[PDB]
């Protein structure tokens, strides 16, 4: 056939480029970083009404100060999360401190290109890693299967990403509040989702310095959805 | 480096054929004719010494080989494959039997070990099957005299008499008419020489024919005296002269 670690004539790794196509088929995940915190939101996308939607876990805690959202082949993310959690805890053991969000992200991205003929293929999932540390404050990273990670003020990944990213382009400014960010994630998720957005098929989360990483209750998100509907009807 | 061929080179085709085994059998078909006949008091194995050049000393090339003092082997197909199989067969007779039980293995079990080695070349990674069919004649105390065929697949069958290689189809028909359950060893040798003459084109004498027997114990070939229970090897390779003597009464 052909090598798994083969370069294309354009200078790209075939397998890495193909895994990016799998991520485009995944459910939407959006992250927005503010000076009051970082918000992470996801589309759950249940395949059937009999599937209990609260069992869909696409937002995940890595440590008290670091959260993570996923999009693509979500089964591939489990070992990445396990590594991230281990790295975060191990560093605390070695250094009696929290680990930097960037350093955590770098540790996850080191796994990415460890494939060949090590694992047999790249990961088929992209991650939004959001957190806080004392040095660089509130941060949001986009970890890809290429081993590359970009920091973002705001980022959308998954099937509705380019439409959502264009929307984030206009809406984001450096003075956003946490409440404004929450509504903004809900607004853009509602735009790109196939089904009508509610508290059962969409999930919010945030990371603040005080309270740490928190996944929002369905009751709490339902209120923010109702607050969104009214403010859009307000003009 | 490293052997990176850890996958099978012999695989099932859509029709259920194992191609490499079939092709190995085709190589055996091209090989020179060899045969085996079982008598009441012995077994005979024989083949033609197809000399590649008249400058070559064909005595140095042994197609019939001693495996144990009571077991011998002959082949048809690829000579080099046969040679390494004889080496492994001789060694496995010691490692997997004699060093455990203090005696040489019975014919059927040594055959089983050889068969196993050939089967493994049919399934293991990065190897082709052996391109030979063996005929193994031997004797042991509890089974008596026996004659086995071993194919590239690793399958083995016991025979009263048989032939393999070039003119096997004709030779087996010739043996069916002549064989009976009352043959003495000398009668089997006579039939062996008759059968082998049909497949041979050129010279037919003691120097172009290789023939060995599994018969009576040979205390003269033991090399030592002083142990009554040790009576000598039953395997014996017939000399060029001994063959020619029987070609006059042919």
């Amino acid at each position: 056939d052909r090598g798994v670690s083969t370069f294309s004539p354009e200078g790209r790794l075939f397998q890495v480029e193909y895994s990016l196509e799998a991520i485009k088929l995944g459910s939407t995940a959006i992250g927005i970083a503010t000076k009051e915190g970082v918000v992470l939101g996801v589309e759950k996308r249940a395949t059937s009404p009999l599937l209990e939607s609260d069992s869909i876990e696409k937002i995940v805690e890595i440590d008290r100060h670091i959260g993570c959202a996923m999009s693509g082949l979500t089964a591939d993310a489990r070992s990445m999360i396990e590594h991230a959690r281990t790295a975060a805890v191990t560093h605390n053991l070695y250094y009696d401190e929290d680990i930097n969000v960037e350093s955590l992200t770098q540790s996850v991205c080191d796994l990415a290109l460890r494939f060949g003929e090590l694992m047999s293929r790249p990961f088929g999932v992209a991650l939004l890693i959001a957190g806080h540390d004392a040095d660089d404050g509130y941060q949001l990273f986009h970890a890809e299967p290429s081993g590359t990670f970009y920091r973002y003020n705001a980022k959308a990944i998954g099937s509705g990403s380019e439409g959502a990213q264009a929307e984030l382009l206009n809406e984001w400014h450096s003075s956003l509040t946490l409440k404004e960010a929450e509504l903004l994630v809900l607004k853009i998720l509602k735009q790109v989702m196939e089904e009508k957005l509610d508290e059962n098929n969409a999930q919010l989360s945030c990371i603040t310095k005080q309270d740490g990483f928190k996944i929002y209750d369905n009751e709490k998100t339902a209120e923010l959805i109702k607050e969104l509907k009214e403010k859009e009807a307000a003009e | 480096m490293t052997d990176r061929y850890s996958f099978s080179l012999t695989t099932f085709s859509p029709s259920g054929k194992l191609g490499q085994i079939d092709y190995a059998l085709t190589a055996v078909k091209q090989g020179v004719t060899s045969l085996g006949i079982k008598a009441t008091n012995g077994v005979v194995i024989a083949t033609e010494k197809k000399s590649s050049s008249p400058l070559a000393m064909s005595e140095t090339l042994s197609k019939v080989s001693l495996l144990t003092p009571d077991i011998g082997a002959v082949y048809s197909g690829m000579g080099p494959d046969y040679r390494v199989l004889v080496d492994k067969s001789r060694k496995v007779a010691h490692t997997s039997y004699k060093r455990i039980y203090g005696e040489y293995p019975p014919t059927k079990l040594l055959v089983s070990e050889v068969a196993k080695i050939m089967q493994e070349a049919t399934q293991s990674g990065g190897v082709r099957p052996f391109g030979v069919s063996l005929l193994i004649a031997g004797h042991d105390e509890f089974n008596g005299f026996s004659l086995y065929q071993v194919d590239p697949s690793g399958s083995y069958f016991p025979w009263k008499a048989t032939a393999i290689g070039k003119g096997s189809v004709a030779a087996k028909t010739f043996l069916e008419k002549r064989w009976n359950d009352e043959l003495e060893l000398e009668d089997a040798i006579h039939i062996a020489l008759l059968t082998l003459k049909e497949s041979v084109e050129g010279e037919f004498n003691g120097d172009t024919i290789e023939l060995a027997i599994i018969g009576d114990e040979n205390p003269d070939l033991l090399g030592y005296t002083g142990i009554p229970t040790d009576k000598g090897p039953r395997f014996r390779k017939l000399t060029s002269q001994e063959i020619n003597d029987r070609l006059e009464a042919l």
């Binding site: 370069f7 354009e10 990415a112 003929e117 081993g147 590359t148 990213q165 | -």
Partner: protein, 231 residues
């Protein structure tokens, strides 16, 4: 064509296509410039962003107090190679109490990249590196290609549109080599060099990345408002 399936296969004209495709990844990468005098060596790198919300990908990596590089191509491959250099610089210090020579650092990178071009299963590195350093024989600048070829130069540039900066340095050769004991002027020449490779976009405060090493100057990276002085 039929001979580009893996790195272990020469073409009929004696070419290694997988290596050439790896070389292509560098050309797609953002421009970076390297140049030196007799006292100092300077790296200038144009950082690339994904979009307006994203950060600008870092291009320069420190290897030791007296050595470091800038990258163009696959950033993870630069991380692997820079990590290797860090270890080799560190082995030299711990074992021999000796700062690793820039020339010997180049030889080590060449040999590491080479093994990936002759063996089955692996792949060539998809990144080009510009190594600067100050050792016992003064200032140095190296250009690393993932084919294995390493070259000591007065100045150079790699990445997209790097030919413009390389021509400028080829003209300015006699001028910038003489900029001794003046770091700011050597950086100016490097900033002016990388400007010859720009189209549409210009050098902004979070776009530009500069590094310097010299006689009494540890390898230090300048980003953000620290490079506004040179814009």
């Amino acid at each position: 064509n039929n001979y580009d399936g893996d790195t272990v296969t020469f073409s009929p004209t004696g070419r290694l296509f997988q290596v050439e495709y790896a070389l292509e990844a560098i050309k797609q990468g953002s421009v970076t410039v390297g140049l030196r005098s007799n006292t100092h060596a300077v790296l200038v790198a144009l950082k690339r962003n994904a979009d307006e919300l994203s950060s600008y990908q870092k291009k320069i990596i420190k290897c030791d107090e007296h050595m470091g590089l800038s990258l163009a191509g696959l950033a993870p491959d630069a991380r692997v190679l820079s990590n290797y250099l860090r270890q080799q610089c560190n082995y030299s210090s711990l074992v021999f109490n000796r700062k690793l020579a820039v020339e010997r650092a180049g030889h080590l990178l060449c040999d590491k990249a080479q093994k990936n071009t002759q063996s089955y299963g692996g792949r060539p590195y998809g990144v080009g590196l510009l190594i600067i350093g100050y050792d016992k024989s003064g200032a140095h600048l190296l250009e690393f290609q993932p084919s294995g070829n390493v070259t000591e130069l007065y100045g150079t540039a790699i990445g997209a549109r790097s030919q413009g900066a390389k021509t400028y340095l080829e003209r300015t050769l006699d001028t910038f080599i003489k900029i001794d004991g003046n770091p700011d002027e050597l950086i100016k020449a490097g900033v002016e060099a990388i400007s010859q490779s720009l189209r549409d976009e210009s050098l902004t405060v979070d776009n530009l990345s500069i590094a310097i090493v010299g006689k009494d100057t540890p390898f230090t990276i300048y980003d953000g408002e620290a490079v506004a002085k040179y814009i």
